[PDB]
Symmetry: C3
């Protein structure tokens, strides 16, 4: 046989490159997943991740209460935290024994898979009673925020998109929903009559995940990296795997 | 300048009226929200509210168990309440130590925003195992109940719609879902191929809220009124804000 | 009058047969329900049931965590079970004090109502972090598993469809979603523009149920049988009610 790495008959190397390329491309086909992650960062260094994976379109919608830190199997000040909520829903509406709940997120990072079309991203960032803009009567139900997403890149390939915002002020008390649509450069509408019932099924079939990791280190080591997910850490370091035309 | 309140050049007054009118009208445009609230009233005077706000269409679906009173951070008889559930799902199926659980709702009020089309309202009022009419084989999945909705009015303007029903009998053990569609007097179908994927995203983007208030007083003062929401209290008093062509 | 059971003027018998037949047929009309059940079987003999009932299409999507046994009002080792989860999401990622959590399901049975079209059934069986096939980049979002469904029959009539799989190995740690579409032998697409907004409402109106029964006996006696639901027990015994052209 020819010698490895010296001619066009290194079929092992050609198959390696094709295997990676096909992964990249399959995900971007209409058969492929689109995924979103919402990361909520707490003052104790812990991080809640919420992930949804679906065909065609994907999104996550959470209440104010759902985004607050919850330590499974530990004490969570749960009566006092009911009261915090009451005081957040209406000023002076509660009887809490603290000024600022350390369970409130300090920041949020939204990440989409590279299979989203960024122009389709929509976000409803509401207040703590789930109203997008002060009063329902004047609320648009979402903002198209794609322009603010940064490309997460590795080895010059886009591995995902990130939108990050801090909530460092006392008044940053939010509800949040986000949604994006899988790329579709074709003229075949996935929601056209021929395929609409499959998009309806996709609502049922989407897989969801949530978990609280104790540190960004643990999130990177045991959630982002092992699953080849895209990420951007507090130091602006990019995580993910470049696959297109690569060994 | 002209004197306030004496001519057509009180631009401050014209802008005030337009600001209110635009709020009213924006909500009724296809860009605007449609909202629903389900209120579950307990014997202790407390009230669970569940709210969803979305574009195009909106709804809420809850189990029997989800509608039972839950006091956050307090004792809830949780083992005995598992047994109550078993005895509600099948007669004599449980081992509870009470005849009637005071956590069961005594009544339900469904309220829609004035942006719903009442003719589109649908309700699935099921039994405690989530079957709409005794057996699935003979169940229609919903009833169109719009005819029963009362107009909540303020200053002669419709600020919302209410459907209220008591559950005063031992056998009133329910699951409940409701749904309504945003008004659309046009011939542009929001679910037509051109816009269908946006309705799909709206499923992701809808913002949800739930909370238990200790009294209808507290609900009115700290939830209904501050958010300019429509409501009808036990005395048939109407709450909400009239906006159309008003200062 | 004629004597019972001796001529074509036993109108009571004709009405009995029609009453049963109409139940069978109504469910199979486009007005009728389609239902799905997911049963998760635990080592202690208990069974979680999750049911959804809807028009047009139906499905259930659960996380790894949601499928683990939870005993309401009893001790559930909840801190240790947080750690089990961490060790399931990533090998050696947790600090649990057990090798195998007895809360993990040992098997799953998926049952659809006889109103589903089996060819439309789709399943996303993911790993414990909700990825269908190792990495999102190479995951198809579902498999069409209809071929594997067995017909549950009674008195020669199909009363439902079952797909059963054991999870007897340590590595059988799953997330799961399933979806099926109501039969529609017509050329009227329920998701066509004329009716699409009703399918959107059906997402809101679907009724859901979940409960943990302590034994398959209790599940059969107090959940399957009283509601005329189809089922297949560990002995391959079929449950349900034959209705078509029957008294
Ligand atoms: Cl494609
Ligand atoms: Cl409009
Ligand atoms: Cl029909
Ligand atoms: Pd503590
Ligand atoms: Pd700032
Ligand atoms: Pd949906
Ligand atoms: Pd979680
Ligand atoms: Pd770096
Ligand atoms: Pd108590
Ligand atoms: Pd009555
Ligand atoms: Pd939907
Ligand atoms: Pd709640
Ligand atoms: Pd009054
Ligand atoms: Pd224990
Ligand atoms: Pd095996
Ligand atoms: Pd849906
Ligand atoms: Pd449950
Ligand atoms: Pd048998």
């Amino acid at each position: 046989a020819d010698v490895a790495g010296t001619s066009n008959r290194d079929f092992r190397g050609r198959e390696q490159r094709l295997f990676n390329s096909e992964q990249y491309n399959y995900n971007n086909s209409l058969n492929g997943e689109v995924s979103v992650w919402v990361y909520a960062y707490y003052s104790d260094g812990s991080v809640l991740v919420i992930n949804k994976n679906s065909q065609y379109k994907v999104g996550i919608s959470e209440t104010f209460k759902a985004l607050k830190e919850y330590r499974e199997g530990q004490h969570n000040d749960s009566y006092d935290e009911y009261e915090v909520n009451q005081s957040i829903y209406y000023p002076n509406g509660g009887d809490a024994r603290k000024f600022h709940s350390n369970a409130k997120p300090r920041a949020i990072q939204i990440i989409f898979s590279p299979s989203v079309n960024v122009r389709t991203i929509k976000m409803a960032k509401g207040n703590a009673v789930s109203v997008p803009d002060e009063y329902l009567q004047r609320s648009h139900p979402w903002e198209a925020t794609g322009i603010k997403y940064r490309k997460i890149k590795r080895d010059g390939e886009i591995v995902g998109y990130s939108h990050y915002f801090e909530l460092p002020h006392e008044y940053n008390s939010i509800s949040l929903a986000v949604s994006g649509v899988h790329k579709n450069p074709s003229s075949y509408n996935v929601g056209s009559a021929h395929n609409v019932m499959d998009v309806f099924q996709s609502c049922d079939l989407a897989l969801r995940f949530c978990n609280r990791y104790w540190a960004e280190l643990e999130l990177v080591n045991h959630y982002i990296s092992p699953n080849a997910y895209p990420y951007l850490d507090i130091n602006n370091h990019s995580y993910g795997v470049a696959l297109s035309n690569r060994q």
